[PDB]
Amino acid sequence: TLNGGITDMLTELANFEKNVSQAIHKYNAYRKAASVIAKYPHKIKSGAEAKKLPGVGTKIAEKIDEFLATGKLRKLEKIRQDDTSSSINFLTRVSGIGPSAARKFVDEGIKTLEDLRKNEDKLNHHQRIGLKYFGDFEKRIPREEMLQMQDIVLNEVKKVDSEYIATVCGSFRRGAESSGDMDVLLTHPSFTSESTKQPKLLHQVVEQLQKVHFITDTLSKGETKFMGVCQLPSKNDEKEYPHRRIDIRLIPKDQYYCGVLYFTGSDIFNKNMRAHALEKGFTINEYTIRPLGVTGVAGEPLPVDSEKDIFDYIQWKYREPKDRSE
DNA sequence: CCGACGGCGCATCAGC
DNA sequence: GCTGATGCGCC
DNA sequence: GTCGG
Ligand SMILES: [Cl-]
Ligand SMILES: [Cl-]
Ligand SMILES: [Mg+2]
Ligand SMILES: [Mg+2]
Ligand code: NA
Ligand code: NA
Ligand code: NA
User: Fold this and answer.
1) Residue A322: phi, psi to the nearest 5?
2) Which domains does chain A have, with CATH numbers?
3) Residue A200 in contact with residue A262, Cβ under 8 Å?
4) B3 C1' to A154 CA distance, Å
5) Are strands A141-142 and A225-230 parallel, antiparallel or unpaired?
6) Which residues contact A305 (CB under 8 A, 6 or more apart)?
7) Mapped to the 3 state alphabet, what secondary structure does A241-301 carry?
8) Backbone φ, ψ for residue A93 (5° rounding)
9) Residue A7, annotated ligand binder?
C-alpha cells in the first residue's frame, strides 16, 4: 500500500458520489482511479505523475496535489461535518438500504442504529436481516474459515446430487487471504442454455444447507440466484463464529466459463474487461460473449471452451484469477 | 464538445 | 394477474 | 470524472 492515503481518499469520494450525490458514473470514475493507483508500483509524488495513469484526470490530479501537500482534502473535511451526508453514508452500510432508502429514512428522522432498531416495522425483509447482522457483515472472513465453509458446501451439495459442481468464486478464487463474503457458482447437467430438465435445482441445495444449519437466513431467492446468510458451526464451549453473507448462483452448465469469469471478478476487473470488449466489438455477460453487429445489436454466442478463449476474442493476454484483483 | 461509462437477478410498486 | 420501471444487490 | 474522436 504505497499510495494508501490517496486511494482511501478516492474511495471516500466514490462513496459520497454513490450514496449522497447519487452519481453512479462519478462513483465508477473514482473507483477506477483508486484501482489504477493501487496497482502503480511507485510512491506517487505529484498529481501530474498520477495523471499519466488511465482513469486519473485533471480533477483527481488536483485533489492528489492537495492531499500530498496537506495530508487531507478540504472537500472531504466538509463532507464529514455534514450531518445529512454523514447520516446517509451510515445508513447505506446496512444491507438492503441504498441511497434512495437512506435519504428517505433520514427524512423521517431515522438516522442512527438505535433509530433503525426501534423502527423494524419500517424495514423490508432484506433490510431487517441487514440490521440484525450489521456488525457481523462488516467483518472479513479469514481464508482459513473460507476453507471450512468450502468443505461444508461442497460436501453438502454432493449429498444432494453427485452431479452438482460447486465452485467458490469471488475474492476466494483470486487467492485473497480474507474475503468479504462467500460466492458459490453452482452447475448441474440438468440445467443448460438449451433446457431445464429438473425443477428446484437451486432450491434443493439451499434446503440442504438450511437443514444442516449452515444457511441461517434468506435475503432474496429465485430460480438462479440465492442471497443469504450462513454460519460455521462452533465447538463445545466455543464462542460462535460471526454470521456471513453467502451468494449462490446457478449457471447453465455449458456456460460455465463465462459464469466463472463473471463470478471471479473483481467487479472493477469485470467493468474494465467488459468495456474493453465493447471497444473491440464484443459484449460479455455471465452467459456468453457475442459480437456486435454493424447496427449495435448483439449477434450469436461465440464458442467458448475456456476462460482464456474469452480473453483471446478481445485480444487480451490471459490473466490468472490472482491477477484480477482490481 | 459530447456521448458513453458493464451486465443482469430478485424485490417492490405503479398502471391497466 | 401482467408488464415495465426502479431500487439494490452481485462480480 | 474521464476518455475517445
Ligand atoms: Cl454520474
Ligand atoms: Cl446471453
Ligand atoms: Mg464476494
Ligand atoms: Mg463485493
Ligand atoms: Na490519465
Ligand atoms: Na446498503
Ligand atoms: Na458475494
Assistant:
1) -65, -15
2) 1-82 (1.10.150.110), 83-139 (1.10.150.20), 140-262 (3.30.460.10), 263-325 (3.30.210.10)
3) no
4) 47
5) unpaired
6) A257
7) CCCEEEEEEECCHHHHHHHHHHHHCCHHHHHHHHHHHHHHCEEECCCCEEEECCCCCECCC
8) -75, -10
9) no
SS3 per-residue string spanning A177-222: CEECCEEEEEECCCECCCCECCCCHHHHHHHHHHHCCCEEEEEEEC
Q: Do strands A182-187 and A165-169 pair parallel, antiparallel, or not at all (unpaired)?
A: antiparallel
Cα–Cα distance, A21 to A44 (Å, whole number): 28
Q: Do the beta carbons of residue A251 and residue A259 sit within 8 Å?
A: yes
A92 is in an annotated binding site: yes
Q: Which residue, chain included where needed, has cell 446468510?
A: A229
Indicate the helix (H) or strand (E) that contains A226: strand A225-230
Name the 3-class secondary structure at A229: strand
Those residues whose beta carbon sits under 5 angstroms from the ion ligand 5 are A 56
Which three cell numbers, joined as nine digits, stand for A217? 437466513
Collapsed DSSP state (helix, strand, coil) of residue A76: helix
| Elucidation method | X-ray
Give me the resolution in angstroms, 1 decimal: 1.6
